[PDB]
Design a protein around this ligand. Structure first.
Ligand SMILES: *[C@@H]1O[C@H](CO)[C@@H](O[C@@H]2O[C@H](CO)[C@@H](O[C@@H]3O[C@H](CO[C@H]4O[C@H](CO)[C@@H](O)[C@H](O)[C@@H]4O)[C@@H](O)[C@H](O[C@H]4O[C@H](CO)[C@@H](O)[C@H](O)[C@@H]4O)[C@@H]3O)[C@H](O)[C@H]2NC(C)=O)[C@H](O)[C@H]1NC(C)=O
Ligand SMILES: *[C@@H]1O[C@H](CO)[C@@H](O[C@@H]2O[C@H](CO)[C@@H](O[C@@H]3O[C@H](CO[C@H]4O[C@H](CO)[C@@H](O)[C@H](O)[C@@H]4O)[C@@H](O)[C@H](O[C@H]4O[C@H](CO)[C@@H](O)[C@H](O)[C@@H]4O)[C@@H]3O)[C@H](O)[C@H]2NC(C)=O)[C@H](O)[C@H]1NC(C)=O
Ligand SMILES: *[C@@H]1O[C@H](CO)[C@@H](O[C@@H]2O[C@H](CO)[C@@H](O[C@@H]3O[C@H](CO)[C@@H](O)[C@H](O)[C@@H]3O)[C@H](O)[C@H]2NC(C)=O)[C@H](O)[C@H]1NC(C)=O
Ligand SMILES: *[C@@H]1O[C@H](CO)[C@@H](O[C@@H]2O[C@H](CO)[C@@H](O[C@@H]3O[C@H](CO)[C@@H](O)[C@H](O)[C@@H]3O)[C@H](O)[C@H]2NC(C)=O)[C@H](O)[C@H]1NC(C)=O
Ligand SMILES: CN(C(=O)CCC[C@H](NC(=O)N[C@@H](CCC(=O)O)C(=O)O)C(=O)O)c1ccc(F)nc1
Ligand SMILES: CN(C(=O)CCC[C@H](NC(=O)N[C@@H](CCC(=O)O)C(=O)O)C(=O)O)c1ccc(F)nc1
Ligand SMILES: *[C@@H]1O[C@H](CO)[C@@H](O[C@@H]2O[C@H](CO)[C@@H](O)[C@H](O)[C@H]2NC(C)=O)[C@H](O)[C@H]1NC(C)=O
Ligand SMILES: *[C@@H]1O[C@H](CO)[C@@H](O[C@@H]2O[C@H](CO)[C@@H](O)[C@H](O)[C@H]2NC(C)=O)[C@H](O)[C@H]1NC(C)=O
Ligand SMILES: *[C@@H]1O[C@H](CO)[C@@H](O[C@@H]2O[C@H](CO)[C@@H](O)[C@H](O)[C@H]2NC(C)=O)[C@H](O)[C@H]1NC(C)=O
Ligand SMILES: *[C@@H]1O[C@H](CO)[C@@H](O[C@@H]2O[C@H](CO)[C@@H](O)[C@H](O)[C@H]2NC(C)=O)[C@H](O)[C@H]1NC(C)=O
Ligand SMILES: *[C@@H]1O[C@H](CO)[C@@H](O[C@@H]2O[C@H](CO)[C@@H](O)[C@H](O)[C@H]2NC(C)=O)[C@H](O)[C@H]1NC(C)=O
Ligand SMILES: *[C@@H]1O[C@H](CO)[C@@H](O[C@@H]2O[C@H](CO)[C@@H](O)[C@H](O)[C@H]2NC(C)=O)[C@H](O)[C@H]1NC(C)=O
Ligand SMILES: *[C@@H]1O[C@H](CO)[C@@H](O[C@@H]2O[C@H](CO)[C@@H](O)[C@H](O)[C@H]2NC(C)=O)[C@H](O)[C@H]1NC(C)=O
Ligand SMILES: *[C@@H]1O[C@H](CO)[C@@H](O[C@@H]2O[C@H](CO)[C@@H](O)[C@H](O)[C@H]2NC(C)=O)[C@H](O)[C@H]1NC(C)=O
Ligand SMILES: *[C@@H]1O[C@H](CO)[C@@H](O)[C@H](O)[C@H]1NC(C)=O
Ligand SMILES: *[C@@H]1O[C@H](CO)[C@@H](O)[C@H](O)[C@H]1NC(C)=O
Ligand SMILES: [Ca+2]
Ligand SMILES: [Ca+2]
Ligand SMILES: [Cl-]
Ligand SMILES: [Cl-]
Ligand SMILES: [Zn+2]
Ligand SMILES: [Zn+2]
Ligand SMILES: [Zn+2]
Ligand SMILES: [Zn+2]
Lengths: 695, 695
């Protein structure tokens, strides 16, 4: 029979291995010839795997690259202007890859050019609270200083925005062993830790969902009208560069001025972690000088779009998407995900060649330029937004399949919670000590829900990956799954070799998943979810799960507000409307659920309830967007204004409440709280009403 | 049988007559008790007529009313400050209505309060070109002057905005017999002309689709958060008041300064129509003083919403809507339309009681506060926008059924052109000399298409009525139809007694439609269109008709641009992308049409092509809206920036080109032309692509 089990059993660990090896022998940087040739290989193979159509969709977008003949570096300069210390021009390439060309040296994509000279201030992780501590508590002024911050905790783009708003004239990012060196593990190539010469690449934009900086709202097609660079969205205004911890030690060891304010500001190097500004007495006349010569350039990018036409509802689209572009070899990020997508396509294609077709259309995507700001997925969705909003059932992301080997990690819309629970109960756990047990059992055991015993943790979607346009702009139900580490026993940030040259096939095969069994399990979870979304007669969404989280989020935003009881009295700040809307949502969702369970080969009633299910995510979109963030349109979920990676619930209210006690005009600020309460209450009630009887 | 003919034959002229009489014996001003009691009567009757459900939807919105104890008026004052002439405090009530209370005196709804004193400047119709002539050609400065303008040609709100931007400190509006007195016809009550004491009421807002001034984007429900008045949308900043032509003669007869610049500036009074500023020599020290004391007040309004549930596609909505609120008795505006809606409901209800149901759901609406800025329809649509955008097939408006007795007038989306042609070929002409001929024949004869012999004229939708939210904000196919005058033989504006106390039942029964046959024909057209939209198995829209008009509009916007050949060369301004998109739209629409004609009791293919048809209007919506007009989101059609009543095609391009030769930075201005060309081209291609095969 042609059922989910036939699909899942066709998936092979050994095929994933082969594809990963194939995808990671050379660098595939967005906008380079090698990434175009890999796109053409993916297109050809998806066609031979059996998809009905596979096309390239290309766009011309702003990318950023270092100058090959004028390298970026940082110096300590003396009184006279001599450069007495210079940071590295490249990461020591891994064993066997020392003759690979076209390895892009470490840089901060989209840095402006500059040669700023000045005194260092150390700002910890450069979080919002870190700058609060510096400015308000320690009375340190960053204006005209170069700030040095450790990577970790938050998106680097938020660090740069925070530094900018504090008046820094440049930013140095570095990897502290406290955050990127797990105790007892060796450095690559003998272990999975970051060595001292290793450096994390990454973009430092603040795009807030805009896509290509030059064409917000519209696809960067052949006749697109582009903003000039001065009006581009999201570019930083001060130079930025990343370094490793051998270099960082040399910049930090001479720091003077104030002591760190507590141990949460000290990493693991043998330095005092003084905050500055500037160096101690003997070296006080020495300065730091940045040399940045990267250029921004409009460059062609290529997405691969494959289509498996639905037999019954070809106008309903389930999308499996992940990126192809990498910073260097991309052994984890993204090729451990793309290898998995490639095997999923192969499996669906073998069913297709035996005569099967899914009920709904499945679209497969190999996105380009994700590393430069989610540009490929965003421009494609801008191009096709009318199709996606009227026909998009769901979007399943497929970047890195592993960042650890401990247990499963799922972030998704509440609408997919029951789907995930049910699917993981039918899959085998790959974990040692859980032979013959379900993935649900092992996952639940190692990652319990904080709210309910006997269930596993499923997190909110944040951002920093290609589902952003589909979920937060367009309101299509979205989700992601991968294998992860134990975040309890280990206090380091993501995985140590993230965005480094050392992220290789060998990293994965030697130290993460030698049997490719974790990969295979992630393929079954992603593949399984897509199968169920594309094939179940009733869409596998449970509106009642949204009702439960909405109450949780309402309670949580109310508790933030109730830190300010006097102001709530003075300004008549009531959450009554939001709680009322949530109660109504609960009631209506419960009655909808009964109709769904109880409605006869009547395809119109079915479709009309599949359309109610599909448009429920869509109902939380506000076409006016959030304040000063027009492309974040979902009212329940947005990326945190302080950390793009983290999701925030009732973001409009959260941001109106944040730091409200430091606003100069409290009537005005509490007015905007009330406004946002009204917006949320209205939108929740409106979402609820899409599930009432239609007439 | 239960077919369109049974529906149409059940409609009765004599029922329309009775309903009109019933709806026009007392004033039904928005926000007054009498309009609430009429809402409750409509609700009860629609229930007894057989609808499945009839509810009131109420909102609390900003309205405007004169002060009962502090009347608005205008004076000529002398040197000493004596008021030597005062305009009327009320229109002489018509015969038999002289004891009706609660007749609102003439005023400009939403005028601010003020007592400005100054010299008069006469600005003709206060159009954009009128102010150009004054300022640029005649060198007359309106700054600090009171301007007097004749009603006609454009929405009065645009006149007030133009006066404001010219620096006027107040505006006096008046009705010139040139525009409101048809030669050879007598004054009410002996004819249908405006007498000298008659005055046109109306709002002077510039809302640009926003709805309630205090709650743009969101319904004005019980917990709504309201802008303060200073941040309200669309309110004028200078006092404004309307007068009749006896009063106007007294203000104009002493005007001095420059002569009118040509005969297009002279109306029909025995005055020179001098432009001013100020009065001639003997009276030069006399001034005009306005006394305005109207107040803006948040007031409850009530829409009546009736539902006739669909038997097959209950989640697809065809809406018939028109307003109930009137300035005074509303004999034409709106009750000649509402009487027609009431008979349509009665007819559909008689079919329903014999067991019939339409295929799709039909919603019927009696909107409130249309006269105060389309507030009822807008707030309801803001409330229900998610339902309407995913389920709204079409919206058929039903304000005034007559403004003349010569022939039919239709304004609608190109998608309904074939529907209208086919329906009017099956209806009987009510016209003298066309006994036994079709409405199509008589209409085509008296109102030929300018483009094609053998077809009738169908115009673009403008604005100034309740379809605005449904069409220009939400992208639901919309249309309207009424009986109209011969605009050829008569050079007057709309109908003379528009928004005057003299608009009565007797006006209609004596002078417009004594047999109610024109009413009945409009009921058959509106009713017929609703029937066909709600009941035809394939939605009655022809995508190919959009292709034809899009080419016409492209040619037209290109010709405007080509008035500037040097700039088009210098700035590389190409319309190629827009013509390419239009050609593609034509090709794809033609292939879609063949699939539609040729696709088998397969309900999913049918529905998937009914969804393609229904979402085609929707595809022309840009969620970022037009520049500085976020609630005008349709890219093909918007209300003219110079005249809310008139439709403009490719409005984004049109406005970027308007007066472009007077902009200071031509590179910047031609850049914005190119930007708008790109937006239009992209949107047309995107609309076309919603009609390709779905997978
Ligand atoms: C969660 O769901 C419930 C429904 O189960 C919603 O309940 C509605 O609550 C609103 C308040 O936001 C009620 O509003 C009130 O309506 C009264 C009239 O309602 C009756 O008549 C109307 C016709 O217009 C019918 O639609 C309706 O069914 C009732 O028959 C008004 O008279 C009230 O105004 C008066 O009191 C208020 C408050 O003290 C004053 O400010 C006013 O000035 C005025 O004196 C009021 O507007 C509404 O009736 C409720 N509908 C019900 C019970 O069916 C919740 O609103 C919803 N939650 C959210 C957040 O949407
Ligand atoms: C009306 O409909 C037609 C389709 O019938 C559209 O035609 C497209 O036109 C665009 C231009 O806007 C063409 O774009 C060109 O694509 C070339 C590659 O296309 C081939 O390969 C791709 C894979 O990426 C396939 O998708 C495609 O089917 C072809 O096989 C590029 O190489 C071109 O770029 C080169 O030339 C240009 C122009 O001189 C340079 O600026 C570039 O730098 C580069 O040198 C170009 O991008 C596209 O192929 C056409 N599609 C077709 C024919 O199927 C119209 O665009 C459409 N109208 C509107 C307004 O949308
Ligand atoms: C995840 O799996 C669970 C458990 O299998 C699914 O819930 C179950 O779904 C079925 C089908 O709707 C329910 O069956 C119903 O039983 C009652 C009789 O008591 C009757 O109302 C219906 O005729 C129908 O047969 C079953 O009750 C329900 N079990 C629950 C809620 O515990 C759940 O739907 C799955 N989620 C998905 C697919 O997203
Ligand atoms: C308005 O009325 C006209 C004329 O009746 C409608 O056009 C006609 O629609 C019918 C049904 O699609 C077409 O019939 C077709 O005939 C051909 C054989 O030549 C075949 O392709 C199909 O099997 C079908 O029977 C007819 O050709 C067509 N006539 C035209 C275009 O002249 C029009 O659809 C109506 N518009 C509406 C309802 O909006
Ligand atoms: C655990 N963790 C992560 O998973 C970060 C997401 C990394 C990865 N995303 C990613 O690299 N995206 C790119 C582009 C993101 C964008 O431009 O929005 C990047 O962040 O530079 C992913 O989604 O798997 C994390 C959190 C905080 C931190 F500082 N470092 C890593
Ligand atoms: C012929 N003609 C009209 O039909 C104007 C539309 C009048 C009527 N609409 C209407 O009165 N709407 C109200 C409210 C309009 C709004 O606030 O958008 C008004 O205009 O004051 C209708 O749509 O039938 C016209 C054109 C120009 C002019 F100056 N006077 C009348
Ligand atoms: C990755 O796999 C592909 C597909 O097997 C290899 O590409 C093929 O290479 C052979 C031998 O050069 C050619 O004859 C085919 O035309 C290629 N097929 C394609 C592109 O569809 C590719 O070379 C492998 N890459 C590495 C690094 O091993
Ligand atoms: C990358 O850096 C190089 C070399 O240091 C730049 O090339 C120089 O550009 C300047 C200004 O145009 C010229 O006056 C020199 O003659 C060039 N020098 C050499 C060695 O060619 C180059 O322009 C930079 N590339 C960019 C900005 O993309
Ligand atoms: C750091 O790098 C700089 C730039 O390459 C070095 O300084 C240059 O050295 C050459 C050769 O001595 C001089 O002729 C240049 O004028 C110098 N350029 C600048 C910009 O200073 C410097 O020696 C390096 N420092 C260390 C410690 O290796
Ligand atoms: C793959 O899984 C193994 C099994 O847990 C990991 O290795 C162990 O890590 C724990 C937890 O910190 C230590 O107590 C043990 O000393 C390690 N044992 C062995 C056999 O090495 C391994 O680290 C995982 N790989 C990655 C990259 O996380
Ligand atoms: C308009 O028509 C309605 C309905 O026939 C009249 O309202 C009815 O009046 C009678 C007699 O007073 C009452 O017994 C009914 O309760 C009313 N029915 C309703 C409101 O549904 C109304 O009075 C007529 N108006 C005029 C001005 O003639
Ligand atoms: C309407 O006009 C009247 C009377 O000319 C206003 O009533 C006066 O308001 C002022 C200011 O509040 C008081 O000082 C007077 O004592 C009132 N006079 C009378 C005759 O009552 C009234 O407030 C206005 N109504 C509004 C603004 O809605
Ligand atoms: C125009 O109206 C005003 C206001 O009612 C009249 O002037 C008032 O007249 C009374 C009685 O003579 C005076 O006591 C008031 O002081 C006046 N008020 C103002 C504001 O001037 C005026 O007479 C009327 N003019 C004409 C020609 O009828
Ligand atoms: C209703 O229809 C009649 C018939 O055309 C209109 O009256 C005529 O108007 C024409 C055109 O200007 C004149 O030539 C005739 O003198 C009029 N004839 C009669 C019989 O009155 C009448 O004006 C229409 N009603 C309205 C309000 O337009
Ligand atoms: C920080 O530095 C500059 C002076 O160089 C000054 O303009 C700015 O306001 C300072 N802010 C402080 C001291 O808070
Ligand atoms: C019109 O009037 C005032 C002077 O009272 C002045 O400020 C304004 O600029 C004038 N504009 C002209 C003369 O163009
Ligand atoms: Ca873009
Ligand atoms: Ca509103
Ligand atoms: Cl992912
Ligand atoms: Cl109308
Ligand atoms: Zn990635
Ligand atoms: Zn990455
Ligand atoms: Zn009206
Ligand atoms: Zn009106």
């Amino acid at each position: 029979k042609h059922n989910m089990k036939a699909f899942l059993d066709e998936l092979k660990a050994e095929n994933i291995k082969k594809f990963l090896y194939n995808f990671t022998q050379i660098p595939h940087l967005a906008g380079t010839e090698q990434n175009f040739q890999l796109a053409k290989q993916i297109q050809s193979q998806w066609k031979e795997f059996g998809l009905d159509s596979v096309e390239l969709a290309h766009y011309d977008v702003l990318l950023s690259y270092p100058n090959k003949t004028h390298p970026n570096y940082i110096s300590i300069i003396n009184e006279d202007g001599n450069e007495i210390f210079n940071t590295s021009l490249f990461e020591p390439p891994p064993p066997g890859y020392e003759n690979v060309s076209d390895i892009v040296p470490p840089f901060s994509a989209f840095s402006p050019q500059g040669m700023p000279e000045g005194d260092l201030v150390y700002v910890n992780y450069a979080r919002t609270e870190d700058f609060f501590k510096l400015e308000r508590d320690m009375k340190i002024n960053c204006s005209g200083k170069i700030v040095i911050a450790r990577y970790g905790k938050v998106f680097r783009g938020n660090k740069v925005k925070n530094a900018q708003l504090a008046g820094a004239k440049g930013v140095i990012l570095y990897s502290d062993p406290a955050d990127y060196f797990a105790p007892g593990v060796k450095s690559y190539p003998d272990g999975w830790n970051l060595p001292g010469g290793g450096v994390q690449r990454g973009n430092i934009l603040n795009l807030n969902g805009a896509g290509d900086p030059l064409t917000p709202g519209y696809p960067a097609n052949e006749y697109a009208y582009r903003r000039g660079i001065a009006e581009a969205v999201g570019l930083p205004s001060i130079p930025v560069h990343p370094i490793g911890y051998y270099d960082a030690q040399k910049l930090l060891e001479k720091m003077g001025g104030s002591a760190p304010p507590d141990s949460s500001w000290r990493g693991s190097l043998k330095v005092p972690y003084n905050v500055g500004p500037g160096f101690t007495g003997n070296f006080s006349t020495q300065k730091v000088k940045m040399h940045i010569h990267s250029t921004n350039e409009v460059t062609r990018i290529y997405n691969v779009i494959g289509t498996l036409r639905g037999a019954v509802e070809p106008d309903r689209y389930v999308i499996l998407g992940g990126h192809r572009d990498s910073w260097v070899f991309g052994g984890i990020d993204p090729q451990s995900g793309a290898a998995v997508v490639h095997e999923i396509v192969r499996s669906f294609g073998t069913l297709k060649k035996e005569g099967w077709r899914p009920r709904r259309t499945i679209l497969f995507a190999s996105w380009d330029a994700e590393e430069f700001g989610l540009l490929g997925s965003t421009e494609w969705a801008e191009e096709n937004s009318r199709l996606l909003q009227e026909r998009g059932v769901a979007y399943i992301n497929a970047d890195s399949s592993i960042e650890g080997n401990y247990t499963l990690r799922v972030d998704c819309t509440p609408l997919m919670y029951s789907l995930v629970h049910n699917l993981t109960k039918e899959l085998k756990s790959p974990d040692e000590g859980f032979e013959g047990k379900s993935l649900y059992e092992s996952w639940t055991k190692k990652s319990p829900s904080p709210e309910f015993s006997g269930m596993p943790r499923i997190s909110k979607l944040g951002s920093g990956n290609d589902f952003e346009v589909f979920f937060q702009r367009l309101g299509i139900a979205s989700g992601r799954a991968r294998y992860t580490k134990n975040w309890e026993t280990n206090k380091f940030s993501g995985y140590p070799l993230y965005h480094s040259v050392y992220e290789t096939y060998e990293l994965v095969e030697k130290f993460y998943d030698p049997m490719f069994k974790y990969h295979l399990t992630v393929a079954q979870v992603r593949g399984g979810m897509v199968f169920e979304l594309a094939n179940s007669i009733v869409l596998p969404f449970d509106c009642r799960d949204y009702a439960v989280v909405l109450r949780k989020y309402a309670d949580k935003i109310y508790s933030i507000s109730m830190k300010h009881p006097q102001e709530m009295k003075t300004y008549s700040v009531s959450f009554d409307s939001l709680f009322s809307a949530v109660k109504n949502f609960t009631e209506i969702a419960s009655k909808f659920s009964e109709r769904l369970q109880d409605f006869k080969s009547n395809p119109i009633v079915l479709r009309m309830m599949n359309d109610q299910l599909m448009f429920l995510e869509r109902a939380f979109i506000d076409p006016l967007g959030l304040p000063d963030r027009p492309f974040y349109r979902h009212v329940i979920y947005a990326p945190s204004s302080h950390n793009k990676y983290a999701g925030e619930s009732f973001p409009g209210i959260y941001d109106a409440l944040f730091d409200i006690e430091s606003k100069v005009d409290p009537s005005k600020a509490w007015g905007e709280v009330k406004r946002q309460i009204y917006v949320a209450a209205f939108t929740v009630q409106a979402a609820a009403e899409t599930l009432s009887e239609v007439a």
